[PDB]
Design a binder for this molecule. Sequence first.
Ligand SMILES: CNc1cc(Nc2cc(C)cc(C)c2)nn2c(C(N)=O)cnc12
Length: 248
Amino acid sequence: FHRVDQKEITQLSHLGQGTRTNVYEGRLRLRVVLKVLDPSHHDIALAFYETASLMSQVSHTHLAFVHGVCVRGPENIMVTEYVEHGPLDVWLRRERGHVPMAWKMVVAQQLASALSYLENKNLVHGNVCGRNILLARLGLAEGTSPFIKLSDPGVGLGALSREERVERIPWLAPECLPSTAMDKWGFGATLLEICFDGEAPLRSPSEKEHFYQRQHRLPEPSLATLTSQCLTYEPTQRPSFRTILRDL
Ligand SMILES: CNc1cc(Nc2cc(C)cc(C)c2)nn2c(C(N)=O)cnc12
């Protein structure tokens, strides 16, 4: 990744919070987003640097760009693409009941394309969810289509606590509660979330953890065969993104 000096960035309005991060609008000597990691253990900063490294080595129409990393005292900052309309989950809840199925199918295909690209390079995202899908274009006007960018996955899944992994249910693959196969589950859970206008299935941390421990399966979408195949507890039985992209 590219090293960004603190003199090259300007921190503006708070946008929201991610896992161990605060996300702000900013300027780069370009409008950007600044993902400020909390003062953290070296294992967490390393998992954050691994994400910056992964996203700086890939290039895809539907993957958000990473400008680089800035170290500002105890704060690690990932300088990433400012995407015009922000997260898909927020937008879906605001537009609940007025998002057509054809619009949702375009998003699913664009997301499956980004994930097929990663799968072919044997790279894991590990945080596929509506919150990490950003809208560059809304596709509300006649003759237009939405355009998504899959955000960086933030602090790597391998560095998170059990409590943080439970907070990720239902996007978290069940085998991760105690491989590219995990993104097939994240993809399936994101299709449910999109189908339900940003209302993902599953509640308290104990109820979510009990759901996976008891091997219960997620609700069917209101995409039924595809979610049923992606959301299986057997990782090797999940279809490839080549097959998913064909089935879509
Ligand atoms: C207008 N643009 C954007 C808004 C936004 N808001 C946001 C909204 C919540 C609820 C949470 C977080 C972490 C950010 N995030 N974002 C990103 C990104 N998180 O990578 C990239 N561009 C944008």
